[PDB]
Design a protein around this ligand. Structure first.
Ligand SMILES: *c1ccc([N+](=O)[O-])cc1C(=O)Nc1ccncc1
Ligand SMILES: *c1ccc([N+](=O)[O-])cc1C(=O)Nc1ccncc1
Lengths: 262, 13, 256, 12
């Protein structure tokens, strides 16, 4: 069982982990430490209703501008993911257009993966760990905004119940990136070859790290389907917004909070 | 292509 | 447990054989000419379509274009449903959840089994009595000539996994027992069954495709592609509203 | 949905 093959897989998982640590300053361990109250400098003010919303400020056209905002403030994560992708063995040898294609679909799914780290069943970290926006407060907001985040919380609750750590996620994320079924890929075989190696490394990682979790490997792969669904659901969200017929001054702080989400 | 594709290409290079 | 997983696989296969008259084994035998039956009638151009008109017209019956395939696929829905009843634990779920699982699952399973009737050149129709070529379907006026090509692209890659009916029986069961369907009441017992099906699928693929690296993972990723095709059908219907009519209904009746 | 009615009928 421990042989050159498995040792290569461990070396790959270690390589991915180190590069993930180097690429992503926002790790799951860091998010979990904030959420469980252990980070003195990131004690997130809990925003749970309109009253606390007002106290929180220290610092539809509304919807599209939420999306313009958050999609602009994701540039740093996209650059981090891109840096990480460059460290995946084989990725930079792929056709450049395929690299771009892999990243342009992968980043949204990876952002949601890392968004889950900021989430628990009660809410989501915002403003770099200085705010904690509650799930139920978000859900209570007027249509269409009240429905923005709830399916992400639903995904995150289920994803976090897998108890993956950053060692797991680094490979998981690599597997996401090397998805040979992205539309418009020119050479699918060299991508699938890397992903198969990544999937082998992931499978081993999960055996070594998760003795409790029956079919964790399969359940994790199923989460890639849930991730695609969330991204897909945003397309449908744009349509709901096209034929949205309401005016309401969504509190500007709430618009700012939403720009901190995805 | 989109702005995102342009951000990625820049980061890749 | 290993004998339990093998028994489950065999039970699912036996149910699958009972539930689905046109199996992949039968379809491949027709497609490759290995049967002693008459080779299927072929629709490959306008002449052969008109010549085959009497074989593809309705005798049992803007988005009337798919009412043919809607009706013809009612039988698959029933067969899938009967197959689902044999899945250990399925009929013990709340009936509302059984309905919800099947109502989403059938479309993915129909595409899964449509792939069994497809090769890179075309698809079996009329329960295998006819063969409609991929190029003929591409030849249709836009946007009709784009409807099936995503299906063929999925099918060619899906078929390259070289699954047999034994594999597909478990894979189909795994699809049905998807705990993420909208509106499910009791997710946990669904996942519990699916976990057991996944265990059986894992061992099945290891035993039946020992040299197929990461086939389990690749199969699981195909479920994302299956959902994508179903999702793309929504977009297909929108393209339809923003628009030969009699030909098209019969042409599409055995497709999806 | 008509499909649900067919499925319920097949399940019974
Ligand atoms: C940004 C900010 C908030 C939300 N939301 O709460 O629904 C969404 C976005 C956003 O633009 N998300 C997104 C864009 C593109 N692809 C996937 C998701
Ligand atoms: C029937 C016949 C042809 C096609 N097609 O080529 O796209 C589609 C259908 C059909 O009704 N497919 C379908 C229905 C409901 N959900 C998913 C797919």
């Amino acid at each position: 069982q421990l042989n050159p093959e498995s040792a290569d897989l461990r070396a790959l998982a270690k390589h991915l982990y180190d590069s993930y640590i180097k690429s992503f300053p926002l790790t799951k361990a860091k998010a979990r430490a904030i959420l469980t109250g252990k980070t003195t400098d990131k004690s997130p003010f809990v925003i749970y209703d309109m009253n606390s919303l007002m106290m929180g400020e220290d610092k539809k056209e509304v919807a599209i501008r939420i999306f313009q905002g958050c999609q602009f403030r994701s540039v740093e994560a996209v650059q981090e993911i891109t840096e990480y992708a460059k460290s995946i063995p084989g990725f930079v040898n792929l056709d450049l257009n395929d690299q771009v294609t892999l990243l342009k679909y992968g980043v949204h799914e990876i952002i949601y993966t890392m968004l889950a780290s900021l989430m628990n069943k009660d809410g989501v970290l915002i403003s770099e760990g200085q705010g904690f926006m509650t799930r139920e407060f978000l859900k209570s907001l007027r249509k269409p905004f009240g429905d923005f985040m709830e399916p992400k919380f639903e995904f995150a609750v289920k994803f976090n119940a897998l108890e993956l750590d950053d060692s797991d996620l680094a490979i998981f994320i690599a597997v996401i990136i090397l998805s040979g079924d992205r539309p418009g890929l020119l050479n699918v075989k060299p991508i699938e070859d890397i992903q198969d190696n990544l999937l082998q490394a992931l499978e081993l990682q999960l055996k070594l790290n998760h003795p409790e979790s029956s079919q964790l490997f399969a359940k994790l792969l199923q989460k890639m389907t849930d991730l695609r669904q969330i991204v897909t659901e945003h397309v449908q969200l744009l349509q709901v917004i096209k034929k949205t017929e309401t005016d309401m001054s969504l509190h500007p702080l709430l618009q700012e909070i939403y720009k901190d989400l995805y | 292509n989109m702005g995102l594709e342009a951000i990625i290409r820049k980061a890749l290079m």
